[PDB]
Amino acid sequence: MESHKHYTQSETEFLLSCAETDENETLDYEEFVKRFHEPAKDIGFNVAVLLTNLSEHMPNDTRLQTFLELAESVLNYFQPFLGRIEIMGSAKRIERVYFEISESSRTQWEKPQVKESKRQFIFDVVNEGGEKEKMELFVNFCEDTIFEMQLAAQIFWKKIIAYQQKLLNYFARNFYNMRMLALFVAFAINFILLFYKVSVHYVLEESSGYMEPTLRILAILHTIISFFCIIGYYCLKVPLVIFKREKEVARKLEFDGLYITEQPSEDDIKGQWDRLVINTQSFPNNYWDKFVKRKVMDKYGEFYGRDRISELLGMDKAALDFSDAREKKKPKKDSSLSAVLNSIDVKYQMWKLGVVFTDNSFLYLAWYMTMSVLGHYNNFFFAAHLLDIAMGFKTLRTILSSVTHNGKQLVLTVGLLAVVVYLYTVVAFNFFRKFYNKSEDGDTPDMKCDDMLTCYMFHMYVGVRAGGGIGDEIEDPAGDEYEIYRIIFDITFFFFVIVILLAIIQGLIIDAFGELRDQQEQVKEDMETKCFICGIGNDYFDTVPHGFETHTLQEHNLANYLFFLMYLINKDETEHTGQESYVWKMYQERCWEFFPAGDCFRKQYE
């Protein structure tokens, strides 16, 4: 302690004065730091946020400068523990509130899936969302992310359940590694399938042993890995989507009254599937708000019938259960002895199945598993797993989203192409039907124009892909009976169908690809040269060195805002400060005026 260049002799002797001397000249440093560090840490954090407030408010005072050098000597420990937020409310001025950030919260934020959720939210909130609902979407993302962080931190009857829980947690924790392993084994089995041959009788002939049984081994391994992938997904990401949907339907019931006064339409299948379990037993299973039922009862009971509300909302004939629990409630209750199963609610389970079978990602994993099962029958079905890179990479996802983007325009352009090809088909079937003799010796003429449907298929299949119209594959006129009309026909075909419509389709797809790429890089440029919360700009903070980077990493950090919301939620209210209670009331009433819209601390003060 005296040679580690961090202590003076007075400090070393003062700390040795705190020794125990347990009759053997031995101190337990474990118990020492377990006893003498935690309250010191708490009160040091308090005085640290006090000194930081004093600093960031009153600068340039030499007495406060010495106090601040001592402060920073303390703060070199409390830097990753204190967070600052710039609220705008209750004073019409920017206020820098300070709070504590837990190491567990930092770890759950650094967790992988949280980063993916964050980047997806950033992308879909800068692309689609504007600025009217930007803060609403940000608060929804914060709630979904703190739920995801809770889940990640969570990641005879006492012998099988305790093991299946650990197995499911292992799968949810190694879900992504399982995906990479599935991709690798798919590449391997597809290389083995590339090493193939035929004799009517398939045979892996290009090898000499050591390659036939490994194909079956890799096939069964890929199927097992796909099953593990879907099992891990169902317990890693399904909770998050069902939590999002439960939160949405619960807030629609409470605030808007979607199923009380403003019954949804007939085409919105989401509304009907939510009405399916607006009245189940365990409705808010993941929204951590088990009182939305009572809230909406108290809100819409004195107008539409309390009995009708309690009937259509579940928990029937229990309008006095609140009073029964408030006055002489039951202490506890044993689970059962004769009913070991069927305790779960089949209605809620069917709802969970119906919401996970429309997730558009669980469907992809189900397609993966089904293709693996079919590949077990015919090994060549494992080639469909090579399209997994198209979803795993970024630019390939962009190509697929591009070919899907201009859907209606592409379909209508292909329809116009088919229509003009049909017009050319009917004019050729009427007039120039003697030129479609696709034979060289015959002598049986293979007339491709003695049938309307055959001629139309021939046109649509040959004249579109011929690259030089249709006159370059049928016989030339070379006769002054229909020569000029046939030349006009060929030229108009090559113009309208080849160098206009096909070019228009290609341009539609390539422009969709370019627009998607440009949107992605525009989102990136906005995240790099513009603030998310306030959005004042980059040139304003490009005055001091590293100005904008420190502004986005210290003052207006989205991680800091999320940690502040989590702190307010886990703050045990009646202990909130003024600013904290104000922000909590705004968050409860769903107003979000406490975010700095077009101002900040630097624009407000010196």
Residues 417-436 interacting with a copy of itself (rule: CB under 8 A)? 419, 422-423, 426, 429-430, 433
Q: What is the DSSP letter of 383?
A: G
183 touching a copy of itself, by CB under 8 A:
no
Asked if 367 is part of the footprint of a copy of itself (rule: CB under 8 A), the reply reads no
Query: Is position 134 an interface residue for Zn ion (rule: CB under 5 A)?
Result: no
List 546, 553, 573, 590, residue binding a copy of itself (CB under 8 A): 546
534 binds, among a copy of itself, Zn ion, none (CB under 5 to 8 A by kind): Zn ion
Name the segment binding a copy of itself (CB under 8 A); options: 6-14, 41-49, 318-326, 411-419: 411-419
Q: How many residues bind a copy of itself (CB under 8 A)?
A: 73
In the region spanning residues 500 to 519, those forming contacts with Zn ion, defined by CB under 5 A, are none
334 binds a copy of itself (CB under 8 A): no
CA gap 83, 77 in Å, rounded: 13
As measured in angstroms, the least distance from the Cβ of 130 to a copy of itself is: 8
The β-bridge partners of 84 are: 98
Q: What is the dihedral of CA 470, 476, 479, 483, to 10 degrees?
A: 20
Q: Which of 6-14, 495-503, 524-532, 559-567 is the region at the interface with Zn ion (rule: CB under 5 A)? A: 524-532
Residue 528 C-alpha from the chain's centroid:
21
Among 284, 240, 238, smallest CA distance to 146 is for 240
Residue 183: CB partners within 8 Å, gap ≥ 6? 385, 388, 389, 392
363 binds a copy of itself per the rule CB under 8 A? no
Task: List the single partner that 112 binds among Zn ion, a copy of itself, none, CB under 5 to 8 Å by kind.
Answer: none
Q: Looking only at residues 485 through 524 of this chain, which bind a copy of itself when binding is defined by CB under 8 A?
A: 487, 490-491, 494, 499-500, 502-507, 509-511, 513-514
CA distance 405 to 415: 17
Check binding of 556 to Zn ion (CB under 5 A): yes
CB of 556 to Zn ion, least distance (A): 4
Partner touching 509 among a copy of itself, Zn ion, none, CB below 5 to 8 Å by kind = a copy of itself
Options 64, 350, 399, 523; binder of a copy of itself; rule CB under 8 A: 399
Q: How big is the chain by its Cα radius of gyration, in Å?
A: 35
Q: How far is the CB of 550 from a copy of itself (least distance, A)?
A: 11
Q: How far is the CB of 298 from a copy of itself (least distance, A)?
A: 27
Residue 261: strand, helix, or coil: coil
Among 40, 153, 224, 412, binds a copy of itself (CB under 8 A): 412
Tell whether residue 206 is a contact of a copy of itself (CB under 8 A).
yes
389 binds a copy of itself (CB under 8 A): yes
- We find the least distance from the C-beta atom of residue 595 to a copy of itself, in angstroms, to be 13
Residue 224 near which of a copy of itself, Zn ion, none (CB within 5-8 Å, type-dependent): none
Q: How far is the CB of 563 from Zn ion (least distance, A)?
A: 17
131 binds a copy of itself (CB under 8 A): yes
Phi/psi of residue 329, nearest 5 degrees: -75, 165
Of the candidates 382, 395, 113, the one whose C-alpha atom is nearest the C-alpha of residue 232 is 113
Burial 43-61 (b: 16+ CB within 10 A, else e): ebbeebbebbeebeeeeee
First to last CA, the chain: 43
Beta-carbon contacts of 219 under 8 Å, excluding residues fewer than 6 positions away, are 189, 372, 375, 376, 379, 382
What is the residue whose two structure tokens read 């209606």?
A: 408
368 vs 233: CA distance, rounded Å: 13
Give the residue, chosen from 114, 146, 185, 531, that forms a contact with Zn ion under the rule CB under 5 A. 531
Classify each residue of 129-155 as buried b or exposed e, where b means 16 or more C-beta atoms within 10 Å of its C-beta: eeeeebbeebbbbbbbbbbbbbbbeeb
591: left (phi over 0), alpha (psi -120 to 50) or beta: alpha
Residues 430-489 contacting a copy of itself, CB under 8 A: 430, 433, 446, 450-453, 456-457, 461, 465-469, 471-472, 478, 487
Nearest residue (CB) to Zn ion, 55 versus 538 = 538
| Residue 250 amino acid letter | A
Task: Please state the closest distance from residue 247 (CB atom) to a copy of itself, in A.
Answer: 21
Q: Which of 415, 445, 537, 578 binds a copy of itself (CB under 8 A)?
A: 415
Single-letter residue type at 360: N
Binding at 531: pick from a copy of itself, Zn ion, none (beta carbon under 5-8 Å per type): Zn ion
Q: What angle do CA 327, 328, 330 make, to 5 degrees?
A: 125
Cis ω on the peptide bond leading into residue 443 (within 30° of 0)?
yes
Shortest distance (Å) from residue 541 CB to Zn ion: 8
Residues lying near Zn ion in the complex (CB under 5 A) are found at: 531, 534, 556
